[PDB]
Every structure is written in structure tokens, then in C-alpha cells.
Design a protein around this motif. Structure first.
Motif, mmCIF file in Angstrom:
data_model
loop_
_atom_site.group_PDB
_atom_site.id
_atom_site.type_symbol
_atom_site.label_atom_id
_atom_site.label_comp_id
_atom_site.label_asym_id
_atom_site.label_seq_id
_atom_site.Cartn_x
_atom_site.Cartn_y
_atom_site.Cartn_z
ATOM 1 N N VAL A 1 8.905 -12.535 -5.286
ATOM 2 C CA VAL A 1 8.975 -11.393 -6.191
ATOM 3 C C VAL A 1 10.379 -10.808 -6.044
ATOM 4 C CG1 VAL A 1 6.535 -10.752 -5.852
ATOM 5 C CG2 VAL A 1 8.286 -9.811 -4.353
ATOM 6 N N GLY A 2 10.888 -10.225 -7.124
ATOM 7 C CA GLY A 2 12.170 -9.542 -7.087
ATOM 8 C C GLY A 2 12.035 -8.268 -6.266
ATOM 9 N N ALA A 3 13.001 -8.021 -5.383
ATOM 10 C CA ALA A 3 12.916 -6.889 -4.453
ATOM 11 C C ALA A 3 14.151 -5.973 -4.542
ATOM 12 C CB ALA A 3 12.691 -7.394 -3.015
ATOM 13 N N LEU B 1 11.840 -13.004 3.952
ATOM 14 C CA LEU B 1 10.432 -13.275 4.092
ATOM 15 C C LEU B 1 9.744 -12.180 4.841
ATOM 16 C CD1 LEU B 1 10.668 -16.965 5.339
ATOM 17 C CD2 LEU B 1 9.917 -16.332 3.051
ATOM 18 N N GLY B 2 8.810 -11.519 4.172
ATOM 19 C CA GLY B 2 7.848 -10.643 4.854
ATOM 20 C C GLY B 2 6.420 -11.066 4.539
ATOM 21 N N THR B 3 5.441 -10.367 5.117
ATOM 22 C CA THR B 3 4.063 -10.418 4.635
ATOM 23 C C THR B 3 3.669 -9.086 4.022
ATOM 24 O OG1 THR B 3 2.939 -9.692 6.665
ATOM 25 C CG2 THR B 3 3.421 -12.064 6.440
ATOM 26 N N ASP B 4 2.491 -9.056 3.392
ATOM 27 C CA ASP B 4 1.934 -7.831 2.818
ATOM 28 C C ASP B 4 0.589 -8.110 2.147
ATOM 29 O OD1 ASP B 4 1.783 -5.147 1.717
ATOM 30 O OD2 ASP B 4 3.980 -5.138 1.874
ATOM 31 N N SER C 1 0.829 -1.222 0.000
ATOM 32 C CA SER C 1 0.000 0.000 0.000
ATOM 33 C C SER C 1 0.855 1.260 0.000
ATOM 34 C CB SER C 1 -0.934 0.034 1.208
ATOM 35 O OG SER C 1 -1.648 -1.186 1.357
ATOM 36 N N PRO C 2 0.757 2.084 -1.062
ATOM 37 C CA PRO C 2 -0.002 1.910 -2.327
ATOM 38 C C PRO C 2 0.309 0.598 -3.082
ATOM 39 C CG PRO C 2 1.767 3.565 -2.602
ATOM 40 C CD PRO C 2 1.576 3.316 -1.094
ATOM 41 N N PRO C 3 -0.648 0.099 -3.890
ATOM 42 C CA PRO C 3 -0.466 -1.058 -4.756
ATOM 43 C C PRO C 3 0.736 -0.917 -5.666
ATOM 44 C CG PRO C 3 -2.756 -0.514 -4.695
ATOM 45 C CD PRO C 3 -2.067 0.502 -3.840
ATOM 46 N N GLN C 4 1.567 -1.960 -5.708
ATOM 47 C CA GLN C 4 2.680 -2.089 -6.655
ATOM 48 C C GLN C 4 2.416 -3.232 -7.665
ATOM 49 O OE1 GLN C 4 6.632 -1.519 -5.478
ATOM 50 N NE2 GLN C 4 6.123 -1.435 -3.267
ATOM 51 N N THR C 5 2.565 -2.936 -8.953
ATOM 52 C CA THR C 5 2.178 -3.848 -10.018
ATOM 53 C C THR C 5 3.350 -4.651 -10.541
ATOM 54 O OG1 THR C 5 0.143 -2.851 -10.847
ATOM 55 C CG2 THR C 5 1.563 -3.847 -12.493
ATOM 56 N N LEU C 6 3.226 -5.981 -10.456
ATOM 57 C CA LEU C 6 4.193 -6.926 -11.022
ATOM 58 C C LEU C 6 3.549 -7.952 -11.947
ATOM 59 C CD1 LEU C 6 5.881 -7.195 -7.637
ATOM 60 C CD2 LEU C 6 6.795 -6.064 -9.702
ATOM 61 N N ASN C 7 4.327 -8.490 -12.874
ATOM 62 C CA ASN C 7 3.946 -9.740 -13.530
ATOM 63 C C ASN C 7 4.449 -10.985 -12.766
ATOM 64 O OD1 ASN C 7 2.594 -8.545 -15.710
ATOM 65 N ND2 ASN C 7 4.417 -8.603 -17.010
ATOM 66 N N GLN D 1 9.570 -2.615 -3.630
ATOM 67 C CA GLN D 1 10.350 -1.787 -2.744
ATOM 68 C C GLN D 1 9.594 -1.690 -1.463
ATOM 69 O OE1 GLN D 1 10.759 1.248 -6.505
ATOM 70 N NE2 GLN D 1 11.772 1.815 -4.595
ATOM 71 N N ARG D 2 9.883 -2.641 -0.586
ATOM 72 C CA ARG D 2 9.216 -2.780 0.700
ATOM 73 C C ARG D 2 9.110 -1.496 1.487
ATOM 74 N NH1 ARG D 2 13.241 -7.297 2.199
ATOM 75 N NH2 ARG D 2 14.333 -6.412 0.342
ATOM 76 N N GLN D 3 10.144 -0.669 1.373
ATOM 77 C CA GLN D 3 10.195 0.585 2.091
ATOM 78 C C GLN D 3 8.908 1.407 1.856
ATOM 79 O OE1 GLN D 3 12.155 -0.269 -0.490
ATOM 80 N NE2 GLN D 3 13.034 1.500 -1.595
ATOM 81 N N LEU D 4 8.481 1.532 0.587
ATOM 82 C CA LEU D 4 7.288 2.313 0.155
ATOM 83 C C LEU D 4 5.921 1.645 0.368
ATOM 84 C CD1 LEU D 4 8.730 2.983 -3.475
ATOM 85 C CD2 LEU D 4 9.352 4.391 -1.482
ATOM 86 N N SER D 5 5.878 0.535 1.097
ATOM 87 C CA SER D 5 4.610 -0.104 1.412
ATOM 88 C C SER D 5 4.244 0.070 2.882
ATOM 89 C CB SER D 5 4.606 -1.595 1.026
ATOM 90 O OG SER D 5 3.458 -2.273 1.561
ATOM 91 N N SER D 6 3.199 0.850 3.140
ATOM 92 C CA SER D 6 2.741 1.042 4.514
ATOM 93 C C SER D 6 2.333 -0.278 5.196
ATOM 94 C CB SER D 6 1.603 2.065 4.583
ATOM 95 O OG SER D 6 0.706 1.874 3.514
ATOM 96 N N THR D 7 2.066 -1.331 4.405
ATOM 97 C CA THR D 7 1.552 -2.600 4.961
ATOM 98 C C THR D 7 2.488 -3.799 4.870
ATOM 99 O OG1 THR D 7 0.006 -2.420 3.089
ATOM 100 C CG2 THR D 7 -0.945 -2.536 5.320
ATOM 101 N N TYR D 8 3.765 -3.555 4.557
ATOM 102 C CA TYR D 8 4.844 -4.545 4.731
ATOM 103 C C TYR D 8 5.010 -4.900 6.210
ATOM 104 C CZ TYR D 8 9.679 -6.407 4.782
ATOM 105 O OH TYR D 8 10.796 -7.191 4.938
#
Ligand SMILES: CC(=O)N[C@@H](Cc1cc(F)cc(F)c1)[C@H](O)CNC1(c2cccc(-n3cccn3)c2)CCCCC1
Length: 375
Positions: free
Chosen positions: A43-45, A83-86, A25-31, A56-63
Motif C-alpha cells: 500500500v502507498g504510505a 515492511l511492517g505488520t498490522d 486501528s482505527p481502520p484506514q480505507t484503501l482501494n 499513515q502508520r503513525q495513526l495506527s495503534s496496531t502497526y
């Protein structure tokens, strides 16, 4: 409302199928690559020369961090990461948002492909084979747990390729004829039992144990049909002989050299159909799926005026892998709820003038669980 999910998959030939996903959050779009041959969502990080974007975990309020590394080897490539969640979503899929385990890939070897277009992988197999251990709930289990999405999914993969992943149901508009189901032998890989094999209507007449040594699985993550040593050899022998009128290199039968004929002069009729008979739902009952040459000879683009192909049956020694090549003929239902995989003829089947890939039943076949391998 399954129509929103039809054509939600793309890929290049040989580089697997992907579905658009969001993370964070905000949504990040991957294939994300769609794999029934493993159980991990990764996913590649971090930058990479083959990665066009990344997470980019840093920019996700819900990592949320689980402070554990992880490692996963595949048949050739491999990756390690954190390993994280999100929160996660599928734009072209059911309308829900789930908190799911994610391996953030930090370094990697022979995993990402050049001009791949996909940035991560979605292992749809079962916890039992999760890394590092089976307490790491795979993406799809989370989804079922946290929502009302029925514990079921289907893949229609077609012959610049595309297809559809129907999450949580079957879409009748995507197959013809009858669905035939084969039991999932054990919930780890999508494991199944092959009971009889015929090439051009001739039984290979092996002990059916050799068909499932050490296992037989349905695996979108693998391109080829891959057969145990002994079965591979008999198959090749029988295909060499059904098409001995023509002659080829040997790299070819090993998936090294291509072979070529002039556009439209591709001599299909000299290649035999393969029928794989799967164990049925009823006692002593089986069914067959018949593969066309059009599937086991993948095209390759030249490089110029000739149509050119790779032989897409290779050797295995971890059992039979019904790869994309087998799956392209068919609508494949992953009935997790009822421990079975269903096969029907795909809407996007590929049509020889004289012969046609079929799901056909029922057959009688005795002592069918004499066919399963035991260590
Ligand atoms: C080509 C490839 O290797 N595909 C990956 C998916 C894939 C696709 C791709 F395009 C590039 C890749 F690097 C990996 C797929 O899972 C492989 N699946 C098997 C496999 C092989 C090795 C490890 C694991 N496994 C891992 C976790 C649990 N089990 C699974 C399943 C068992 C039978 C052999 C193939």
C-alpha cells in the motif's frame, strides 16, 4: 454468505481491478488492486501526485515494525518501501480481521496510475515468489491460517468495469454450465498447462511445449493475453488471414494504433474465436475455453462517433499470461486447497448474436505432460 461479496470490485478499463480494504486501528480505507500475478501486499504510505490518499502508520495503534526494506519490480512499474505488520479487513468480504504483512510504499516508479483510484496491491499468488524471500507469508496465507476461511477464492471479472471476488467459496449464482478444473502445475504463480490451441477450429500444430515456454499462468494483474514469441507470431498470422478483407496499421497488431469503424458497424464476424485447451483432472483428458473477439479487442474511448479498440494479445517472453482479457469470459476458481483452477462460463458473459464463449469438455489428448516446459 457470499452475496455480501458480489460486486465488490471496480476498475477502469486496462487499469486492473480493486477491492476495498481497511488497515490499522482505527481502520484506514484503501482501494487495493487484486493480483494473482504476484505475492505481496503493498500500500502507498507517502504522498504521491497520483495517490488521492494513503496509509499513515503513525495513526495506527496496531502497526508493528519489522525494520526491513523491500523492493518489487513488475512488468513495467516498480516500488520500494518498508515492511511492517498490522490488522487488515475487507468490508465487502468475509467477516474477519487478520494481522498481515504490509509493504509500506515510500517511493515508486510507473506504478500508480493517474486517476487510478487504487492505492495499493494485493498479491494473491504463492509464498514461493514473495519478496524479499519466501518467509514473507502472503496476505491470503495469513487469512487461511488465522481464521476458518476455506483455502479457496474466485474471481468473476466483467466488461467503468466491475466484478466479484468470492473469498473462501464458490457462488453458484455467478456462472452457468459446468466448472472445469485444470491442475496447478506448481504452487508459485498460478501455473497451468496449455495442451492444444485452435483458431477458428484450426490447430496451430505447434509442439505443445511452445504454449507453455517458459510457463503459463493465470494473472489478474495483466490486462492482455500474452503469448511466447513463436506462438504470438502464428496466432497473428492466422488472425491477419481470417480478417484480411479489412486493413489496418501495424502499430495495431503491436497494440499501438487503435482501429475504428462507425458505431455498431464493428465487423465482429471477421475475427476468429481462440480455443485454449487446458490439461484436465483425469488422465489423457482436457477441456477447452473459447475466447471471443470481444475480449481480445479491448475498447478505448475517443478522442468520437466511432467505436475504437486496442488489440489485446501482445508478445511475451516469460510464457503465456492469461490476463484479464481471457478471464472476463469466465468465473475462475482458485482451488488452492486442491491444487487446481476451475473455469466456468461467467454470468456476465458478453453476447455476440451468432457465437458464444464456452467452457467445453471433455477432450482426449495424449502425452499431455510432454507439454510442460523444463529448464
Ligand atoms: C502489468 C503488470 O505488471 N501487472 C502486475 C501487477 C501490476 C498491475 C498494475 F496495474 C501496475 C503494476 F505496476 C503492476 C502483475 O503482477 C504481473 N505479473 C507477472 C509478473 C511480472 C513481473 C514481476 C512479477 N512478480 C512480482 C513479484 C513476483 N512476481 C510478476 C507474472 C509473471 C508473468 C509476467 C507477469
Amino acid at each position: 454468505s457470499f452475496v455480501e461479496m458480489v460486486d465488490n470490485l471496480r476498475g477502469k478499463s486496462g487499469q486492473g481491478y480493486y477491492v476495498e480494504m481497511t488497515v490499522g486501528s482505527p481502520p484506514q480505507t484503501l482501494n487495493i488492486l487484486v493480483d494473482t500475478g504476484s505475492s505481496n501486499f503493498a500500500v502507498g504510505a507517502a504522498p504521491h501526485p497520483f495517490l488521492h490518499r494513503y496509509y499513515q502508520r503513525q495513526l495506527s495503534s496496531t502497526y508493528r515494525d519489522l525494520r526491513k526494506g523491500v523492493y518489487v519490480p513488475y512488468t513495467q512499474g516498480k516500488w520500494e518501501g518498508e515492511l511492517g505488520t498490522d490488522l487488515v479487513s475487507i468490508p465487502h468480504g468475509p467477516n474477519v480481521t487478520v494481522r498481515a504483512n504490509i509493504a509500506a510504499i515510500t517511493e515508486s516508479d510507473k506504478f500508480f496510475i493517474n486517476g487510478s483510484n487504487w492505492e495499493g496491491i494485493l498479491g494473491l499468488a504463492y509464498a514461493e515468489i514473495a519478496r524479499p524471500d519466501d518467509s514473507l507469508e502472503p496476505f491470503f496465507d495469513s487469512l487461511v491460517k488465522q481464521t476458518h476461511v476455506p483455502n479457496l477464492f474466485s474471481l468473476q471479472l466483467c466488461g467503468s468495469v466491475g466484478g466479484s471476488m468470492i473469498i473462501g467459496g464458490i457462488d453458484h449464482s455467478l456462472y452457468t454450465g459446468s466448472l472445469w478444473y485444470t491442475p496447478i502445475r506448481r504452487e508459485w504463480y498460478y501455473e497451468v498447462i496449455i495442451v492444444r490451441v485452435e483458431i477458428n477450429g484450426q490447430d496451430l500444430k505447434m509442439d505443445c511445449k511452445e504454449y507453455n515456454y517458459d510457463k503459463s499462468i493465470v494473472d489478474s494483474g495483466t490486462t492482455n493475453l500474452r503469448l511466447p514469441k513463436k506462438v504470438f507470431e502464428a496466432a497473428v498470422k492466422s488472425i491477419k488471414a481470417a480478417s484480411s478483407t479489412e486493413k489496418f496499421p501495424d502499430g495495431f497488431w503491436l497494440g499501438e494504433q487503435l482501429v475504428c469503424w462507425q458505431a455498431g458497424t464493428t465487423p465482429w464476424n471477421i475475427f476468429p474465436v481462440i480455443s485454449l485447451y487446458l490439461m484436465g483432472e483425469v488422465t489423457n483428458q482436457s477441456f477447452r475455453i473459447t475466447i471471443l473477439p470481444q475480449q481480445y479487442l479491448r475498447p478505448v474511448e475517443d478522442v468520437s462517433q466511432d467505436d475504437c479498440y486496442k488489440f489485446a494479445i501482445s508478445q511475451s517472453s516469460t510464457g503465456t499470461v492469461m490476463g484479464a482479457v481471457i478471464m472476463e469470459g469466465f468465473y475462475v476458481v482458485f482451488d488452492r486447497a486442491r491444487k487446481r483452477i476451475g473455469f466456468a462460463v461467467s454470468a456476465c458473459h458478453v453476447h455476440d448474436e451468432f457465437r458464444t464463449a464456452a467452457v467445453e469438455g471433455p477432450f482426449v489428448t495424449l502425452d499431455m505432460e510432454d507439454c510442460g516446459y523444463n529448464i
